[PDB]
Write a protein that binds this ligand. Structure first.
Ligand SMILES: COc1cccc(OC)c1-c1cc2cnc(N)nc2nc1N
Length: 445
């Protein structure tokens, strides 16, 4: 196994990775900012290194400080987690170049998928169904651009190639808005990503957000581990995730799944990864690929039995996948509620000290969090402070366990979205299943 690794992250995911390392007998190096000396995973790590002050640019995005920490402790690999440098190709490249293993794919694979246009071209070539679109970047010729939009059919969406999530994109519903919308998306992309390249896709009006978890090793094995529905969201921020997706038949699962596995072979993918799709009218349309472990990975683990973080560490060490595709079975159902330190009226981060904490327990209840009684949530990082994942023999049992768990959960001293999560679990449309990406925002309205 890897002897010792640097966990280049913080919070729940850093604790998640630390647990996996200890199971595997891997030594841990917890790199942390000065604000994060009292993190749960830091206090459990074999070795700790303070890599800088609170703001991320000087700590968790500080490439030299992180690599220097790996050098001085004699670590052999770096896990980026999610959300920081985890999809930074230059970082992965620099890590590989410095002599350490980057837990993830090759740097060139990271930048292929970090460029949305070329990612789409790669997937379309490999046989993955995509959104009807421009099939290339848009130029400055508005006659060409209008012809592309006519061919696609209004409404259309303009997207930044260097973009991702909700950055940066606008819907165009007629010719009259097209030129200005391309210009505005370009300007925003140039400012944000130093990449003004944009593409066009047919705008899907009411889709679901269904994504496929994959694993691929260094010995030619590539598997899919079913799907996740992530439609319960607000402004490109996932709120509830669940596995498998309601309404997806075993035969739809293998259809799209096998196509994702083949794409991995074609591109020589390595590690965990997620294929993000829009699902509408029984049809899958690829939009982007995440080349890292995701926040919502625990729901896939519950229903397959596969420890994805352990697999990442096995792959990085040159072990094959511990599971064959024929041995991957979907059993039961899992729901994840993100727990955020946020104000219920503004949805702005609400940091501060937790005065009382109690975690829920029981059969099928998994609590993924670093928080404890007396812990202070800092203002410098993301608002998500924990993940409640509940598993049942079916969807209704999973939701029923979630409601129970949410009621056992005590987090005093700070504002949370626990009451909102309770409302969603009690929502009749959610309880039916299959709600689109716009549902939560219109329920909140
Ligand atoms: C995960 O998908 C979300 C999620 C929230 C909002 C949103 O667009 C307003 C989308 C979305 C919708 C889309 C609709 N059509 C399309 N071609 N691409 C899209 N890409 C998106 N990211």
């Amino acid at each position: 196994m890897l002897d010792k690794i640097v966990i280049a992250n913080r919070g729940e995911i850093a604790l998640r990775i630390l647990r996996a390392c200890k199971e595997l007998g891997i030594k841990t190096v917890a790199v942390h900012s000065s604000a994060d000396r009292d993190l749960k995973h830091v206090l459990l790590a074999d070795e700790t290194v303070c890599i800088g002050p609170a703001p991320s640019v000087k700590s968790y995005l500080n490439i030299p400080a992180i690599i220097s920490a790996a050098e001085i402790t004699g670590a052999v690999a770096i896990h980026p987690g999610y959300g920081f440098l985890s999809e930074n190709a230059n970082f992965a490249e620099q890590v590989e170049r410095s002599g350490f293993i980057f837990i993830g794919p090759k740097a060139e694979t990271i930048r292929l998928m970090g460029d949305k246009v070329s990612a789409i071209a790669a997937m379309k070539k490999a046989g993955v169904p995509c959104v009807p679109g421009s099939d290339g970047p848009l130029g400055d010729d508005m006659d060409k651009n209008r012809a592309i939009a006519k061919r696609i059919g209004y409404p259309v969406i303009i997207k930044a190639s260097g973009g991702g999530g909700g950055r940066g994109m606008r819907v165009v519903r007629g010719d009259a808005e097209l030129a200005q919308s391309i210009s505005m998306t370009r300007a925003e992309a140039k400012a944000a990503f130093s990449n003004d390249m944009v593409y066009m896709e047919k705008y899907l009006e009411n889709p679901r957000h269904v994504e496929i978890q994959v694993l691929a090793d260094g010995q030619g094995n590539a598997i899919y581990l079913a799907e996740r529905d992530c439609s319960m969201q607000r402004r490109h921020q996932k709120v509830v995730e669940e596995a498998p997706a309601p309404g997806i038949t075993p035969e739809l699962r293998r259809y799209i799944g096998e196509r994702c596995a083949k794409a991995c072979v074609d591109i020589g993918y390595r590690g965990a990864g997620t294929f993000e799709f829009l699902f509408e009218n029984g049809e899958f349309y690829f939009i982007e690929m995440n080349t890292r472990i995701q926040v919502e990975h625990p729901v896939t683990e519950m229903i397959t039995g596969v420890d994805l973080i352990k697999e990442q560490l096995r792959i990085a060490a040159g072990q094959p996948l511990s599971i064959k595709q024929e041995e991957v079975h979907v059993r039961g159902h899992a729901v994840e509620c993100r727990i955020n330190a946020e104000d219920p009226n503004t949805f702005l981060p609400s940091p501060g000290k937790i005065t009382r904490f109690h975690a829920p327990g029981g059969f099928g209840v998994r609590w993924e969090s670093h928080i404890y009684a007396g812990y202070t949530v800092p203002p410098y990082y993301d608002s998500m402070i924990g993940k409640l994942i509940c598993y049942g023999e079916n969807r209704d049992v999973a939701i029923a366990r979630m409601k129970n768990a949410l009621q056992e959960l005590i987090i005093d001293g700070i504002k949370t979205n626990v009451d909102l999560q309770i409302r969603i679990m009690n929502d009749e449309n959610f309880q039916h299943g299959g709600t689109n990406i716009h549902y939560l925002e219109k329920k909140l309205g």
